Design a protein around this ligand. Structure first.
Ligand code: HEC
Ligand code: HEC
Ligand code: HEC
Ligand code: HEC
Ligand SMILES: [Cl-]
Ligand SMILES: [Cl-]
Ligand SMILES: [Cl-]
Ligand SMILES: [Cl-]
Ligand SMILES: [Zn+2]
Ligand SMILES: [Zn+2]
Ligand SMILES: [Zn+2]
Ligand SMILES: [Zn+2]
Ligand SMILES: [Zn+2]
Ligand SMILES: [Zn+2]
Ligand SMILES: [Zn+2]
Ligand SMILES: [Zn+2]
Ligand SMILES: [Zn+2]
Ligand SMILES: [Zn+2]
Ligand SMILES: [Zn+2]
Ligand SMILES: [Zn+2]
Lengths: 106, 106, 106, 106
């Protein structure tokens, strides 16, 4: 998937985690988000199209995906332990990550 | 790229880091490992091909890549602070994560 | 030190980081927050004093400090690389973790 | 507890996690290790007794406790999900952390 496709996947599944009425729905959405974040690792965003992939600026870009991927990891452990309220509380943590990368690079 | 190709990138760069003398050599190798681990995320390995995509086995397979990505994240911070020997030692911690996933799924 | 004293150190240093101009101010504040979070680890908060020490509530109380310590770890790496604005933004992510634990246990 | 007391606690509970015949024994030992690691945060080791607590060398010392505390966090999520074999596999990850700090600072 390109960056825009992975972003729609993150957006749809974040909404699911906000509306989830059960653990299985949250677990399924977090697994799709993990796959979209991992796949977005390789992308060059438009604002950085004229920087080499080995540049410090691209390092600072990708750093936000480490944070998101880390937060999804924890949210899935919380969802697996039956903590349905907590797992959703993930949504507040993920949103801050979404916003920081968008503010710097979108 | 395919799972065996990402494993060759992980193996080759782990050896670059062992034999490295400076932070720029360690940084470049870890950047390539981060990209290979991220790219291997959605791979299905041969020994799990007849399992459900949401089998506990496929969950546990992907959990290994969360561990590896987390460790590469920390090693690149140490390399970025010019801590060459610490970054090299951190890359040595990766081997436990290599071995745990191989023991179960290779 | 006691839990309220560590909370005053976290609150005061979070504000130092917001108003900071340079990396040394951000580094010193985050070092104090790391020590306060670590010291608060084994505290029992007033609203959980009649629960088992291994109640899910006390497990969930300590999980919050794991999240906070992880975030302070990453913020100090960014401050150590001289990324003043990123470190300050990272300190802003702490507020979600502040709020989640307060919502349940303060 | 002083550093030596927290270290005996880490050592006794690591052995428990190596010998555990059930999840509850592993969970109890990981909780004691988390408390000992958090409490060891504030300590100055003998080899660094003549460095100020705000020094870079003490920062590099404490960094090893972030790694250990992070690894215990994950081991407890794995133990909680009923993964008794995996949870123990933690013991291999923790040992590497033990050894790195000891090699540099003991
Ligand atoms: C960087 C590390 C990012 C993180 C983390 C997240 N997003 Fe993102 N997103 C990013 C970029 C560079 C772009 C622009 C891509 C382009 O080619 O233009 C986006 C775009 C979106 C969009 C599209 C809407 C738009 O206004 O362009 C959406 C809906 C979106 N991103 C959602 C999203 C969510 C929900 C995230 C976290 C859960 C998230 N993104 C993280 C860069 C980054
Ligand atoms: C799972 C989560 C894994 C982690 C972490 C690592 N590896 Fe791996 N590796 C894994 C599998 C399932 C396989 C078999 C792939 C197949 O289709 O047969 C491998 C294989 C390798 C190989 C052999 C490659 C080949 O023959 O073409 C190597 C050299 C290898 N892995 C190295 C490696 C290193 C160095 C790792 C950590 C740094 C590592 N792997 C992690 C699964 C997983
Ligand atoms: C639980 C895991 C917590 C996290 C993370 C944070 N705080 Fe906290 N805080 C917590 C409790 C249980 C309490 C009540 C303590 C009591 O005995 O009443 C508090 C209290 C505070 C306060 C009030 C202190 C006082 O009145 O003396 C402040 C100002 C405060 N907390 C700030 C704070 C900040 C800034 C945090 C993140 C950076 C934060 N807390 C995290 C539990 C937890
Ligand atoms: C630094 C970040 C450390 C980590 C992580 C761990 N240990 Fe440690 N340990 C450390 C120091 C500086 C010392 C010496 C303290 C002193 O005053 O002399 C120790 C000591 C021990 C000992 C005592 C035996 C000895 O040879 O001195 C033991 C048994 C021990 N440590 C065990 C231990 C284990 C099991 C750890 C991980 C699970 C571990 N330590 C981590 C510094 C650090
Ligand atoms: Cl972020
Ligand atoms: Cl592993
Ligand atoms: Cl939290
Ligand atoms: Cl370590
Ligand atoms: Zn793609
Ligand atoms: Zn959609
Ligand atoms: Zn957790
Ligand atoms: Zn680190
Ligand atoms: Zn190490
Ligand atoms: Zn492992
Ligand atoms: Zn980081
Ligand atoms: Zn951020
Ligand atoms: Zn939270
Ligand atoms: Zn003590
Ligand atoms: Zn003993
Ligand atoms: Zn995990």
């Amino acid at each position: 998937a390109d960056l825009e496709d992975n972003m729609e996947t993150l957006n749809d599944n974040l909404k699911v985690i906000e509306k989830a009425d059960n653990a299985a729905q949250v677990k399924d959405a977090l697994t799709k988000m993990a796959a979209a974040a991992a796949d977005a690792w390789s992308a060059t965003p438009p604002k950085l199209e004229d920087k080499s992939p080995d540049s410090p600026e691209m390092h600072d870009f990708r750093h936000g995906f480490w944070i998101l991927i880390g937060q999804i990891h924890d949210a899935l452990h919380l969802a697996n332990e039956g903590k349905v309220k907590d797992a959703q509380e993930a949504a507040e943590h993920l949103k801050v990550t979404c916003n920081h990368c968008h503010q710097k690079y979108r």
